[PDB]
Design a protein around this ligand. Structure first.
Ligand code: 07K
Ligand code: 07K
Ligand code: CL
Ligand code: CL
Ligand code: NA
Ligand code: NA
Ligand code: NA
Ligand code: NA
Lengths: 407, 407
């Protein structure tokens, strides 16, 4: 099997509109969470969100927007960034050896609702002719494959909050097996009340910090009370190692492990044992120690703890366990975009020799007092191997391991 | 790479609620298309659909339905059928070597719309706590993986009308590469006005045959005027050959080729050249002649023709080209479910030594007069290798080739 490297990155996040902004937010523990006035107006319990701050119309032209919902428009921006970062020519983007696996946890719920409303108010014709590619689950792959003239693989994987970890992992497999030489991999999610209300209704989102929105997401805090929803996108350019070396690519890291398993247990709550099998699967092909864990940890009572137990089972407790820092405390949870964004955060930390604080821990949950949860940013540290978990509703687990390339 | 066989099938279709019913409809060219009174009431141009006729509550118990939209409920039925057909034990369904790749072209649009309506009329709490797993793009994999206690791979692929062909192909790869020994693969789609209107609004669906609904879908007819939308589901059980042989499995066929490519051209219209590359990819691993083509052909002016040209380019014209019969003329188009259902139709035709009529051709389009489009059912024919195309919006192409197992 061939070796596979990351040669370019792009991102739209609640903590920045490019990799430089995101790096600055990570370093300074600057929260991306703000008040969602619209949620309050509609009567939600949770009134916080992680909203990107980016001018779409300035970055994607009107005709290029015809088939984009907002999530996929953010994904288009991230794809332009990743192409520019990788320094790819048009021929390197558009060829039979180059594909795309790009997903979202849902399609444009906004498009679906607006369409139903306008059908009933003004008639079906007034939905307009461009709604299907926004509303279908493959929206992220379809829109980008068509616009960027992708000729190789083209489809979406979805797996809830695991979505873009599986997209990256499957794209890794395509290259390992020799089916493609370059892949664009990642995903996106719109941020819209028509999606967010589904989570508010299940009581899944934070509601006791509405008056201090910036600290509402607080993985590992004793008083965590649910996740904070976000939108955005991310893209990695992946290449077989020979392709990357021969063109003088930047190598942000090598993908050295991928795990994918299923709990077969509960729709919302993780089992823990599935996560253990997923991490062991990712680690089975890794020879070096892990220097940093980017957990799934979403700031929920029932979710943060089984993952910590799974980490304990594999790595042990205390100083022998890799440092753990939950980026969702700053970013919230962007569903389909989470996995790829967390890959990017981890690669940017590796590039810049620091591990961010696991933010907003005012009082550590005593269940986790034995674990190396990062309470203050760690500087001047050389990270060589990093592990990121994403887990999703339906007991779906994905883990990725990235390594600094040194030959 | 390991050999991979189909050991069980399940189906919910507009032309039958199990494989026996479906076989009878294929043999007798019995249309599954009927009047959609609701579409007429809402002011649609198209007033026809392909609706399954199946009593869900009699086949899936109430607690088991908690997280199902109607499409995934049909998918659950198809999964029960496929497990029963394969004769699998509980241990054979639930183990680390057994996974699920199960998709839909969209999630439950009904759930999304109902949720938005009830939020605005009665408040967010009244959405209830079970909406997310119905509304997310991974609904088919999440619900079934959780209920059937799947422990291996668990995710969805989506690619519009290519969805379940890619699900089967990726599951085939998992087994070929040795990552899993058994996979449940397929997909589903609900049938609901909140999805159908999106297609009516683009003018994509048949509207000139509303007074004769049974003949509205008519691939290759000179007067075809758009596709007819349908709902349903299908499931294949896939196994590595040694696993299948050792347990005395039924072998409905061996998967011997898979193609997946991208047009990189137009969002709605196929390019043709992408399809040629996809078929060549599927055929690159096939040594036998193709005895039957199950085309993508959806009964659209702009879609049926480029595929015919691509077939001509690969296979030639006239008698040297494999017989072509468009099952969508009977079934309509079930979006996420199409691929797997067409695999099942093709395997059932192979099992029963016949090729169905390509139905409702009152006047053949003269552009296709040189091609072996089946005008009357062909009996007493031994089919050994069959090819099925599914293509999707966003220029996404998938082709599967199945072969009668003879060693
Ligand atoms: C199995 C296991 C446990 C803890 C750490 C590991 C590592 N760093 C590489 C591979 N396997 C590992
Ligand atoms: C390339 C090509 C053209 C036509 C038929 C074929 C077949 N039956 C197997 C493999 N390749 C083929
Ligand atoms: Cl459950
Ligand atoms: Cl286009
Ligand atoms: Na309105
Ligand atoms: Na992570
Ligand atoms: Na109402
Ligand atoms: Na087909």
């Amino acid at each position: 099997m061939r070796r596979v490297v990351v040669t370019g990155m792009g991102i739209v996040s609640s903590i920045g509109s490019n990799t430089e902004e995101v790096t600055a937010s990570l370093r300074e523990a600057k929260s991306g969470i703000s008040r969602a006035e619209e949620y309050a107006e509609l009567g939600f319990r949770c009134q916080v969100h992680g909203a990107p701050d980016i001018d779409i119309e300035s970055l994607v032209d009107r005709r290029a927007m015809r088939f984009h919902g907002r999530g996929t428009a953010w994904n288009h921006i991230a794809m332009d960034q990743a192409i520019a970062d990788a320094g790819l020519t048009e021929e390197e983007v558009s060829n039979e050896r180059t594909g795309i696996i790009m997903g979202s946890g849902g399609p444009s719920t906004r498009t679906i609702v607006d369409s139903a409303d306008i059908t009933r108010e003004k008639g079906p014709k007034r939905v307009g002719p461009f709604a299907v590619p926004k509303a279908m689950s493959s929206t992220a792959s379809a829109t980008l494959a068509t616009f960027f003239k992708i000729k190789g693989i083209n489809y979406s994987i979805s797996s809830a909050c695991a979505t873009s970890n599986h997209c990256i992992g499957n794209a890794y497999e395509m290259i390992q097996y020799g089916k493609q030489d370059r892949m664009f991999a990642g995903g996106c999610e719109d941020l819209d009340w028509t999606l967010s209300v589904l989570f508010d209704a299940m009581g899944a989102m934070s509601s006791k910090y509405n008056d201090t929105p910036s600290t509402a997401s607080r993985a590992y805090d004793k008083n965590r009370d649910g996740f904070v929803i976000a939108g955005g996108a991310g893209v990695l350019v992946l290449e077989d190692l020979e392709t990357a070396l021969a063109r003088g690519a930047k190598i942000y890291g090598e993908i050295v492990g991928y795990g994918a398993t299923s709990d077969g247990y509960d729709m919302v709550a993780p089992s823990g044992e599935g996560a253990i099998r997923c991490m062991k699967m990712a680690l089975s092909t890794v020879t070096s120690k892990i220097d940093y864990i980017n957990p799934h940890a979403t700031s929920t009572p029932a979710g943060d703890a089984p993952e910590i137990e799974a980490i304990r089972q594999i790595f042990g407790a205390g100083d022998v366990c890799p440092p753990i820092a939950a980026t969702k405390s700053l970013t919230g949870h962007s569903l389909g975009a989470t996995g790829v964004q967390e890959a990017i955060y981890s690669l940017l930390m590796m590039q810049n020799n620091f591990i961010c604080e696991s933010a907003h821990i005012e009082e550590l949950d005593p269940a986790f007092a034995d674990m190396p949860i990062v309470r203050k940013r760690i500087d001047n540290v050389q990270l060589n191997t990093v592990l990121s978990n994403s887990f999703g509703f339906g007991g779906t687990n994905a883990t990725l391991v990235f390594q600094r390339y040194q030959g």
